[PDB]
DNA sequence: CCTATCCAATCGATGTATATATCTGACACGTGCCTGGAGACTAGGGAGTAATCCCCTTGGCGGTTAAAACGCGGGGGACAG
DNA sequence: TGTCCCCCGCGTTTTAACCGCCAAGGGGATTACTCCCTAGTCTCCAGGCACGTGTCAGATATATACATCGATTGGATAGGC
């Protein structure tokens, strides 16, 4: 399931960031960081929805978890 | 396409990671912190995670390509992605 | 309820010929309360430091002067110190 | 011109405390650069609190509140 | 390599008080009365910011193989920090 | 008649300008329900402000003393190839 | 590999940090009083909001237009001995 992040996907991601020669294990360095990041948002976001006795993380629970992480997402506020 | 592919995705504005493997990875992470139970994920909540993670990854790559040219390199290395995760806190 | 159409009429003020999608409105709908939580937030600490339990125009003015950058803070002061006058006298 | 009060041995101690073996030449001015642009963002954000109350004595409380606003809290000056 | 293990084990202020006080009061008139506790509150955070910025810029130094600091070292560390 | 000297002709690839309106489906707005916006009495507890205390930092003169500053030898580091 | 050179250490010199100590009122804080004006409550009253649809802002699909411009070799050709 961690190999769902494909090789031209990370290539396009680094191409958006402006990287000319994208390396090898870099592709394994990205999904690792993507495993570090996406955990740290989800560990907070279900913690918000478990206080209201709910089994569904909404967009606002993602916004609150990201505001806890230090970066404010705009275009998902309901 | 060294001088071609650099000027296309920056002018473009849509997603780069596919929605369904990202959703499957987000659910496989969500079942860890829910004591092992299935969990409903809204369509806005998955796209929010996608838009956050894509922006975070391109920011981490554009903050590491300046460390690539610092060592006289044009080839990105994981030493630059582990150094960019050190001067951020 | 939301700030959205209140954003739209001001959008009709600065750009009547220019349209908009619903995403860029929503970011706009996520913009104002992003700054509100700032300016009403900093003013929540400003009155607390001088042992005041009320917020006048000076606390919001000081929060604008402290949060917004130099050219933006002065421009919001000159846009803010005119609405406290035309509301009390008129 | 009080930017020369931050002297080359002081910048040398600041670099040797940070684990620098060999300091370069412009680092003895670059410090005088960044301490001109960091501290100013500490000064005005500490004087506006002084401009918020009716006073002319800028306490350490205004300093630690300005450093809280910038994002680096300071210990040992609350009460 | 000699005094590196001397200041890291110590805790005293590297920058003197009165030049730092005059430097702070030069910025103060750009926008008073300064307590002696407020000058230490201005000096401790600035010194600990300078030492930490040099420590984080030295990681940019040993990334290119160099051991000597550079003007590009203090301009690349604050780029990732967003300051 | 062998040979050096003007000519061009075939080989080929690599870019956007503004040319559109066509398969779907969402923004501007009309309408209407209403719940929040809004005028207004009323007690009252906070805002504003004078008098005074006394505090604490500005103000200053001196001692000797650790700390700042300056010039030379050179030796391993920075960066060029 | 390799040669250019930049701070490091040390001998020497000195100007200003720090301490010791008296001063003394700027003004922060405290007391107390008097009055703003804003929350509680209440009836009111009206832009702002969901329902719903008219249709226009836009986002591909993609045919192939668009004209020369960078370069190499074989055939005539005027002079030589």
């Amino acid at each position: 399931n961690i190999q769902g992040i494909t090789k031209p996907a990370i290539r396009r991601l680094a191409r958006r960031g402006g990287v000319k020669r994208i390396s090898g294990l870099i592709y394994e360095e990205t999904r690792g960081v993507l495993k570090v990041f996406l955990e740290n948002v989800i560990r907070d976001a279900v913690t918000y929805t478990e206080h209201a006795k709910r089994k569904t993380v909404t967009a606002m629970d993602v916004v609150y978890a990201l505001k806890r992480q230090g970066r404010t997402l705009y275009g998902f506020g309901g | 396409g060294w001088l071609k592919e650099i000027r296309k995705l920056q002018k473009s504005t849509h997603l780069l990671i596919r929605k369904l493997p990202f959703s499957r990875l987000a659910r496989e992470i969500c079942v860890k912190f829910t004591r092992g139970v299935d969990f409903n994920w809204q369509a806005q909540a998955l796209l929010a995670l996608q838009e956050a993670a894509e922006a975070f990854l391109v920011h981490l790559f554009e903050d590491a390509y300046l460390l690539t040219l610092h060592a006289g390199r044009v080839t990105l290395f994981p030493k630059d992605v582990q150094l960019a995760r050190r001067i951020r806190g | 309820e939301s700030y959205s159409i209140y954003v739209y009429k001001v959008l009709k003020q600065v750009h009547p010929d220019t349209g908009i999608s619903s995403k860029a409105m929503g970011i706009m709908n996520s913009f104002v309360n992003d700054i509100f939580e700032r300016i009403a937030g900093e003013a929540s600490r400003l009155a607390h430091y001088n042992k005041r339990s009320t917020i006048t125009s000076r606390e919001i003015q000081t929060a604008v002067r402290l949060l917004l950058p130099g050219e933006l803070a002065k421009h919001a002061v000159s846009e803010g110190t005119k609405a406290v006058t035309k509301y009390t006298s008129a």
Side-chain angles (χ1 to χ4, degrees), chain A, chain B, chain C:
Chain A
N1 203 1
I2 208 177
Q3 292 296 320
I5 315 297
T6 65
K7 180 252 287 182
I10 309 175
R11 178 174 181 177
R12 278 172 296 184
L13 278 174
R15 201 77 60 191
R16 183 165 284 189
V19 178
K20 263 187 55 203
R21 206 176 180 198
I22 304 142
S23 295
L25 76 159
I26 276 291
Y27 296 134
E28 290 299 317
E29 193 67 34
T30 308
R31 319 176 184 106
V33 168
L34 198 54
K35 204 171 185 180
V36 171
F37 181 72
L38 282 179
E39 270 169 346
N40 281 274
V41 194
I42 280 176
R43 190 43 208 145
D44 294 305
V46 197
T47 316
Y48 280 105
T49 199
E50 77 178 43
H51 180 247
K53 273 84 68 178
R54 284 193 286 106
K55 328 280 190 173
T56 309
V57 161
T58 64
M60 292 312 290
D61 297 317
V62 189
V63 183
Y64 300 152
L66 284 159
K67 209 193 172 63
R68 192 262 183 189
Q69 290 313 285
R71 44 186 272 130
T72 165
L73 203 59
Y74 278 173
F76 283 96
Chain B
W2 277 358
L3 77 168
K4 183 225 181 185
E5 203 182 6
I6 287 282
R7 285 186 285 115
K8 169 188 168 62
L9 301 168
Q10 289 182 331
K11 204 181 300 181
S12 180
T13 330
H14 45 64
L15 294 170
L16 293 177
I17 307 180
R18 307 304 298 270
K19 315 160 176 290
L20 204 55
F22 198 90
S23 187
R24 211 187 312 120
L25 182 65
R27 289 177 217 276
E28 210 195 27
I29 291 177
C30 200
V31 296
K32 311 176 179 183
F33 317 121
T34 47
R35 314 157 194 166
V37 68
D38 71 315
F39 198 84
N40 302 330
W41 271 90
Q42 279 199 356
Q44 303 287 314
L46 299 159
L47 291 173
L49 270 182
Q50 193 167 2
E51 270 290 326
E54 276 193 8
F56 164 69
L57 282 175
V58 301
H59 194 74
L60 196 61
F61 282 150
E62 77 188 327
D63 282 356
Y65 206 68
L66 319 171
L67 318 178
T68 312
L69 272 295
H70 197 217
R73 304 167 186 172
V74 72
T75 298
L76 182 61
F77 282 118
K79 282 182 168 184
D80 306 291
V81 195
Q82 287 184 327
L83 203 67
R85 280 187 47 160
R86 194 44 189 85
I87 324 171
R88 280 187 186 186
Chain C
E1 64 190 16
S2 86
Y3 280 99
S4 157
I5 314 188
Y6 306 116
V7 190
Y8 191 73
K9 302 146 64 180
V10 187
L11 175 59
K12 275 305 166 187
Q13 285 187 153
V14 289
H15 272 86
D17 63 326
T18 311
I20 201 170
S21 300
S22 198
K23 290 188 177 64
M25 293 300 293
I27 306 172
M28 294 300 293
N29 205 71
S30 85
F31 170 69
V32 175
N33 65 328
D34 178 67
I35 317 292
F36 182 86
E37 187 70 29
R38 291 183 201 198
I39 305 183
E42 188 60 44
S44 315
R45 310 289 184 269
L46 277 160
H48 190 272
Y49 298 155
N50 209 1
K51 293 180 172 184
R52 302 221 161 99
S53 64
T54 194
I55 292 178
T56 64
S57 317
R58 204 153 167 268
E59 282 86 3
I60 311 287
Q61 169 186 48
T62 319
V64 166
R65 284 288 295 161
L66 271 164
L67 280 163
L68 299 199
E71 206 62 45
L72 204 58
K74 291 179 177 183
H75 278 178
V77 158
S78 45
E79 275 281 315
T81 43
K82 60 105 176 178
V84 286
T85 50
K86 72 204 290 204
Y87 172 70
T88 318
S89 46

